[model samples]
Target: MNEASSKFVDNIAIEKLLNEKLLRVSHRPKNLFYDDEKVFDDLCKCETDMSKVKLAENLKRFEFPSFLKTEEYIENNIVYLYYHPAKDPVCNILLLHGLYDDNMLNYGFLTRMLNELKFNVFLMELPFHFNRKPAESFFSGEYFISADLLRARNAFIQSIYDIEASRNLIGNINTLPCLLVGFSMGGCISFRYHMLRDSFKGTFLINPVTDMLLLVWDNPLLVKVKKDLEDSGVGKEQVMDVFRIIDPCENINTRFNTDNIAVVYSIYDQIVGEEKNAIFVEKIKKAGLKKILEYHAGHLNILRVPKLSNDIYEFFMSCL
Candidate 1:
């Protein structure tokens, strides 16, 4: 059953990836590789200080672009915050959705569930996702991970910047204990966010893409991305160097209270691969993270399992 479900999910992902409009190899840009390490170093230095976060008068929707100069669409530059306030909330929960998620329907139940647990939910829209998508974009997150390596890098940096800026919305709800819940691509962003700021009471990652290189090179869904990089004379080493700053496993020695982090990954995850997930789990365990849950499910179907949410609810309770 697990293998059947995994194959089913992989087939759907493969079909979507074959769309000629997405990640076109012909659009590969020249000089995609970055030689200066400082370029990445500067981008990775996310502002964690809440005082440093410039809050807009209206926290519900506002424009907060980390880089003043950007060629992205005006819509993509705007940050949208969906706040679901719980009466007498015990803790504030920030929820990040995965790439290409067109709507919040997948997370609707989970958001309500968190509210039921007395947690104020703050749903953040990642760059190039949902209403933030550009007019030319074929799909919601099409522009985020495409032939343009520079744009993809900026998208990741923008996600972290927006997350840091989200401190304003979080503070608006009163700074109670806060936890982060990230799914898939959001898990990758959540890990990067926690690396910059250790203030989160706890973090939960679901089927995260721990190695960006794997996603760009090995993942079946990104075959076109690999073709674009290769056609542009980009090499494996350059890809590794360019993305190392954002790779969570690379900075394992960083100050993450490993005990406060929990992960639940599908053993049969075809999109992120079990090997990549295991590599991250192994590194975190070496760093002292104890709560690890592995299920015999696929990437998409894992969320349907009742035990997954129950375990997450219990883990959050333990963190509190």
Candidate 2:
């Protein structure tokens, strides 16, 4: 535990420095707040039949209200998919990356390792990230989560839709069973996906963001966002009420089979609080999930650990 705490402190210091120097922008556009209540209600009632989702290689555009648009990037509106096929594949795996994952280099080593292990890997770029980032963005995923609560909510909805579309495209290409892997913010999306569409053979989450409230209120990364919300007179409870539609914990009765679900979380996670993650784990346990993996590393450093990749690979294989 002492070693874990040391690593967590070191990782946090490095991340703070990097964020200040490379990631943080001096001037951020205030969130363009708008009403999305009716839209949310409509989306909740909308059921996407994965089987009916179309298979298209072309870039697909997702529309939003003009007022919601900050800057127009032709690429940001389109959904992009990258496919890495292994020789004589054992199974298919879809990877959902965390926020601010601009460079593929962070995931390069893991994807290559998976390919070598005979897994066909598919990486879907989440909305407003990487190549999908808008022209006015300071950094990748800058627009995804900000003072703009409605936009953030819509981004989640868009990502869920894109995941469905990607799954359909994958199914059209191969009949092999496909698994789901999500990291950080991606983990939240994976959790919600399971609740809405329980199709994956197995779902694996790594240091996932479980509580939207904690992210906006307590995370060091979102300090500026918190300030902006407060300046705008947005109360925490109001934000919580608005985000309940997307919060997995709020939809407790909409349970899916948790037998094939597994989670990997850091004991000293500074980004996603350990207590919040434990509460989420408890909820999953109550819902019937059987496997939980704990690590002594921090959130960001855990991705670079070789043992994590090995354990994930072993767990993926076990699902088969």
Candidate 3:
């Protein structure tokens, strides 16, 4: 545990918790999706050539079976998406969205922009988001980040499983280079996926959650979960310990080719902290200036800005 403390909290607290939890340090996951070692091994065994039936261009949809099956989450057994194929594709870009977004609607404009530039776009639907969202939930993403820790772990693992499946499907479709581009929570997953796999041509993250513990503490939208955790007698120490196992921050030392990773962030992002994103940049210090683009704004509005979007599109163009 870090002994340093800043505006966040005393690292003393983390040290105390780490010592206290040592007796119970087994930290076994009660969920299947979180069995990281096993799931990763299974994922690698999946065939690269995948099966899919093309639908109308008006719909531009395709469906394929999942390689890593989660029996409880029947909704995630199949992967579905809006596929925009360029007449002569140069690269395949798998796009992952932020929290509460299940489809390409949030990315529709950018998808069209990339498509016009001859990049085949695969807009992915994360587990428990979009069509795969469970009927019991009012919102698409609540199941993934609710009070239940196992559910949160399941969401992360399931999303990775689906991503690998998408990668395979893209591999079967064309020999063009494939890349990953994610926004917010999608950036969180994309970062971890890159940590685990090195096959993609590259990865791009926008406003990614670099530290999950800090993200949960900083984001007002997650206030209720924080309150509930405290009210239920669950200490931050224990949660932080478990989060280290599930979050990508623990995997910071895991690196890819510096040239293959790019990050676009706002200096003043409110939802995903700027300093938090800076931590990622410092760790990936080998990345060139072109791989890092900064904007002078906050979170939501940054996405709305046309120039930033164009900047992102241009970066991908340069990648190919």
Candidate 4:
């Protein structure tokens, strides 16, 4: 890319656009009456009983009943497991999935490879995705990133609760080092999880969304959302104003250590938003990451590429 074209992709321009608004978001979501207590009240009620976690030789699966309940009955709880365990494991990974994924099938090859290397893989199902999805919704996870700002915040809170519970269980059961591998939407949550609580020994984010504001503006996948925003009387200049109110990523805690985090991106990808990812990449650099891997392929293609996966495996192996 030429210098001018590169400058066009620079996050500086996008940063300037966001500078128009000073974002002030509550740590939790608030309703029209300014009620934020209701969400957490139930969330605090939920707990993880390690004994309930079913184990069978190399496989163990369980439902982490969340304190938060939603319209989707099954999805109210998070379901995950240590799929195909590795004997005398070096460490366990909390594998997070993207928005489109349903089960372990999404990371079938990668999980198998990690298991073969004696790394136990613990897979997590994101809220509203997979079995947790509401039957009324046309697609699983559609409610997660929907236009309803309240629902969106609630989704993140629910996911956060589940992830924290995952960390709790991992910390209790295993004396081995714990690593995190989050893909796409999962990557975003995993990164957020590290920022919220720094317990994992290492973390890897694949095509993670760093800035929700930038993502809504830059990615091709959100064009429909953009139109919906416009239809709601939010002009281009007012986009940040609306997003600043509801985007949890914009208000996340930043006391994270960059030393243990590795970021992987796609050069020709625009799924998470082009300039959107650029802003995130800029943050990654500032956080002091030791390695950043870029793929020549697109968003989905990077997952299928053997070399990229191998590079990730090696990177984690070194970290371990």
Candidate 5:
């Protein structure tokens, strides 16, 4: 794992643009599973080996977000939000979804945990997901690598905006402290958003992609290669430089410098294994930016496993 040859992370600065606007991304799906391993591996520079990815922890969790509803400002343009606030109200916990997923469903056992703790939870649906998906493609593809960049930046902006919009409702009933939880793709954005809005107490990320290009260029499974970039809307001037401003790792404020942060991971799991994510975790630990947590499972299992709730609680406590 230490000597793996991959330039995807290094190349990320050159290949992807961070701040391109997506004018026509349309149906915001509640949740849609991406079943293409070959394509995902290709997107991750072939570093992700699904067979090696563990899944026994996968369980059909019964927990649900406190309120699953939409907050629409205009007609078609809508933002789906879920609020799971602490009973006593610690602070508002904002949940952000990955890639093409809407808010809500990703919580798994987390829904119940937050409710019991009386912590406020808010989830925002991402572009081209759930009801937000355009009728044409529905957000499934090997060409999504490009969208990962621009769309990631856009999600950050929107979430920051949404937080302000929801701020009234959150503070209206009772003023409280708050934090954020993001996994995988969402982790990247949450990391970046932290920089833009640095007041958050802390953040929780599971199986985060510290470096995007690491998975992209190293990924042998993502198809459509350069076409994914072109179609995903990355422009010339916005390519590399924008990343410095948008990437969480590069920005000091984006990440908590490893002090008040919580990071978890699993071994033998597919996609973003120990090698891809560990070094970053080590850096965070070394930098004293956040507290680090670990488990014996892989990426998704860390969230879906039956024991995930307790584990999450433990992580949440460290933050407290």
Candidate 6:
């Protein structure tokens, strides 16, 4: 192979993102009319104790429900999920599916691998995908431009509630152990869980998305939405101010101490720029980490690779 070709395949070792400067996010005044929390709390309290997702009209299948459809039924907007409960052994794992997808099956071998490893996996359906869609008009591509900063923050908060609900359900069943694993946007969900809950023993972040502000810039639809909101009498200063608060990576509180927190990153993550990851990685390293796992594959491939999980099992084995 030529030098250029060799460069294309070879992996690079990365250092941590240690900018050290404390990230400040404020001016996120609550939306009074909606009373986001109270509205959501009422929704949660009213949620059916079973999955309403109807793949088939069978009696047994009726027991397994999706909060996504439930949230959509209540909010008429997207509501993200940070957790979901699995069956017995009480070994609950929050498996966050990435953007453009809600099914864990997309991760191919990784999903099956965890199940084989005796992990009671609860595959969460993220916002705006699956049954948690924003609105019927969004099919024509409006949600991308309509959901602004406060909306984004509200979606994230609902996801945290989902995680809490999962934990509550798990305790009702059994209490073995629990772990949170997120991919892409799913990582954002897991990151939020780390912020609110300390019961999680492990966090498996694969090519985890560390920033949303950049994601919005790269997205044509979200970019369009940003422009549309600005045009709709929303001030730029207000948007920027609220956006900074909504970004989880910018808030250090998202990195709650855990028994194990492994960040697996790749140099070729196209959806997420490598340099941006470098900055986030530095902050984590400075904060100290359970381990840093590196890979050669890009974003989606990180979850596809078996070595990622193999390396993780080793790390888990070493945990106290």
TM-score of 2: 0.81
Better structure of 3 and 5 per lDDT: 3
Writing each residue's lDDT as its tens digit, candidate 5 over 1-320 gives 21121223323422332211122232121222222223112211212222322222132111111111223312113444555545665556766665534335657467667667666676655444554444554342211344345443333444444443433344444566666777766777666555555446677776666765344444433333333555655443344433444455555533344555676665533556557667677666565654565666655545555555555556556645
User: Residues 1-320, candidate 4, lDDT per residue (tens digit)?
Assistant: 23334334434433432342112111122242324434333433345787766544544675656545674455556555555567878888888887645446657777777777778888877777766777765555666765454566567667767876776777677788888888887887777666656677888888776665555565544555555655666555544544443343564435567677788877655455456667667766655666788666555545555675566567667753
| Model 2 whole-model lDDT (C-alpha atoms) | 0.72
lDDT of 6 by residue, 143-226 (tens): 222434555655555566666555555554457677778787678667756755575777778778777656554533244445
The global Cα lDDT (0 to 1) of model 3 is: 0.67
Can you write out model 1's per-residue Cα lDDT over 1-320, one digit (the tens) per residue? Answer: 36886769766876765664455434574555555455335434444343433444433433444442356477787666677778888888787888777767677677767677787777888888887888877778877887677777778877877776665447654869788888888988888778777667888888777777556888776777778778888887777766777777787787757777788888778787767787888887888878888888877776566676567678878843
How far residue 124's Cα lies from its native spot in candidate 4, in Å, is 0.6
Over 4 Å off, model 6? 1-90, 102-104, 134-147, 218-221, 230-237, 253-255
Better of 1 and 2 by TM-score: 1
State which candidate, 2 or 4, has the greater lDDT: 2
Decreasing TM-score order of the candidates:
1, 2, 3, 4, 6, 5
lDDT of each: 0.73, 0.72, 0.67, 0.63, 0.48, 0.54
Steric clash pairs (candidate 1): none
- Top candidate on TM-score is 1
Q: What is the C-alpha RMSD of each candidate to the true structure, in Å?
A: 3.8, 5.1, 8.9, 8.2, 13.7, 8.8
**Which portions of model 3 miss their true places by more than 4 Å?**
1-39, 48-57, 286-290, 308-320
User: Model 4 clash tally?
Assistant: 2
User: Model 3: per-residue lDDT, tens digit, 260-317?
Assistant: 6777776666556656767766765634324777766555444545665466557666
Candidate 2 lDDT at 103 equals 73
Please state the error at residue 197 of candidate 3 in Å.
1.1
What root-mean-square deviation over C-alphas does model 3 reach?
A: 8.9
lDDT of 4: 0.63
Candidate 3, pairs of clashing residues: none
* Steric clash pairs (candidate 4): 75-132, 219-273
